[PDB]
Amino acid sequence: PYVEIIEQPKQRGMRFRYKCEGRSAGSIPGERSTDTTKTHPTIKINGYTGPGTVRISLVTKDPPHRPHPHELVGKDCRDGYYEAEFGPERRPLFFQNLGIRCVKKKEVKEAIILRISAGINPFNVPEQQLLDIEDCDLNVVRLCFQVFLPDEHFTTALPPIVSNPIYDNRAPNTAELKICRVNRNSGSCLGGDEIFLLCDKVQKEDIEVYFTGPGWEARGSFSQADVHRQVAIVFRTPPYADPSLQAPVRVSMQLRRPSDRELSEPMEFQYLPD
Amino acid sequence: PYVEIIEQPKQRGMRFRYKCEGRSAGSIPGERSTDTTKTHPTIKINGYTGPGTVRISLVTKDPPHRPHPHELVGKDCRDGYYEAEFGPERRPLFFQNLGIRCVKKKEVKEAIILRISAGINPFNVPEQQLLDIEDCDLNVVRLCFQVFLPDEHGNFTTALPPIVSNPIYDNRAPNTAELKICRVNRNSGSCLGGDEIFLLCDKVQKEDIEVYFTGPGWEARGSFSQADVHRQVAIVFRTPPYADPSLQAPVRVSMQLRRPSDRELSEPMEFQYLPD
DNA sequence: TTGATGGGAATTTCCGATTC
DNA sequence: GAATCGGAAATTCCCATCAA
């Protein structure tokens, strides 16, 4: 048989906690989790019922999928990975109290060496590239689910599968984009209105303010000098498609990161006839 | 004789460099420095001419002037203090090479003990109190000048009374940083007040900041909540009502960031109240 | 060019408010 | 309570500038 991910983890939102912040790094959310009810990364073993073992490991975002320096902590976790005892019942396979613990940049080598020492290299990658020579990333991880089926004395290894990449909300370039507050949400259809936009930490060299409407797009209009300490952007509204507005049109304004073409939740802006 | 400070240090502006930032902590500027010419901490030895030695160490701000964990670095500095030289003439005694290196919060004890082991306790504070010192005193230091004058057979040991300078503040710690308004939404409003202002500024503490409007015999505060202080560098408030709600012509007042703790004030910005 | 300076941002660590 | 979380403080790091 094989393994399948039913509820992928959420990708943007949570901070990778360090070891010094102690305890557990909370618990990775389900992709569709909300305040009404919270979902958790959950899997099912297609075409099988019975006992077994599930082991979860952090792996790189990119194809070779090396084991990742960061490590999981929480329920049923030890030595930096998850390895729990599977029960026939299942409803299906929930993983709530998983938590991503990031390691200091200096402890990266000793961590990878610690991982492959325990024989965790799910995709048996050649050694010359696993020990690395380049970067790594450290802001993006992927869950790796390894399922072992009965034979113990749980050794029948199903194919290991990866989740969607998970992004550190604390890193400026992989963080979730968020408009916190604006001085005003309406302006002349001619544009040129100065807007003070308060947001979560961005990088001045990598941020734009993207206005859109049905078959229309326009950018902010500012310089890097206009990005105050990563959390305020002072820009001027762009001209709208129709400079002769007779009634207000509702457009959608949002922060956009060119690097990964990511977008904040839209904020309603209203072009006025002027 | 005795020693007196001719040019006090500047108090606010420079950040205490860490040991890891390497290099040198720049050079402590004189109080009266400008862009044309920079002044340096300078002293004179009242009523005396001859040889000697000057030793400078950092000590706490508060009445009992305990030795301070942080340390000086630069010309004629070693082991965390400044010592020796200036004997013959060159009578203005100035210290331009000075640099404040701060020590990590863990290694504070090791610093104090390393200092008093070198026998530096200018104001001979008891040992029972040196056992302390962990607090907000990591952000404020004082220069302590000890002057030793020649004595019997020619040895710089006499020791004049120690004098302290004005406190020097870490520009990097939020509670001791220099206040600065960087850019504002608009600088004119109804004399009735209630106009929303977006103020972009240097790192402040939401629990210890107000927006202080003043004019000839008049003061008024910002009006905002801590929830309105975005990520320590943005204040969204509403202007207060002016003294005269019946303005017939515009009146220009000065708006500025104010820190209640040490009543410090930013450079004022002009704001003109308008006839409603 | 070489090194010191200045000032912003990245990285780690802490801590009080909320919530479990 | 104990745990979680969002914000701030504490250290490092790196680059753009100015002195060497």
Author numbering:
A (entry chain B): 2 to 154, 157 to 277
B (entry chain A): 2 to 277
Quote the authors verbatim.
To understand the difference in DNA affinity between Rel and RelA, we solved the structure of the mouse RelA(C46) chimera homodimer bound to a consensus NF-κB motif. Thus, the different affinities are unlikely to be due to differences in the DNA-binding surface. None of these Rel-specific residues contacted DNA directly. Notably, the residue most likely to contribute to the increased binding affinity of mammalian Rel was Arg101, a sole residue in cluster III. The positively charged Arg101 is located behind the L1 loop, and its long side chain and guanidinium head form a network of hydrogen bonding interactions (dashed lines) with the backbone carbonyl groups on the L1 loop. This interaction could stabilize the three Arg residues of the L1 loop (Arg16, Arg18 and Arg 24) in a favorable conformation for DNA binding.
NF-κB proteins are characterized by a Rel homology region (RHR) that supports DNA binding and assembly of homodimers and heterodimers. RelA and Rel are the most closely related NF-κB family members. One specialized function of the NF-κB Rel protein in macrophages is activation of Il12b, which encodes a key regulator of T cell development.
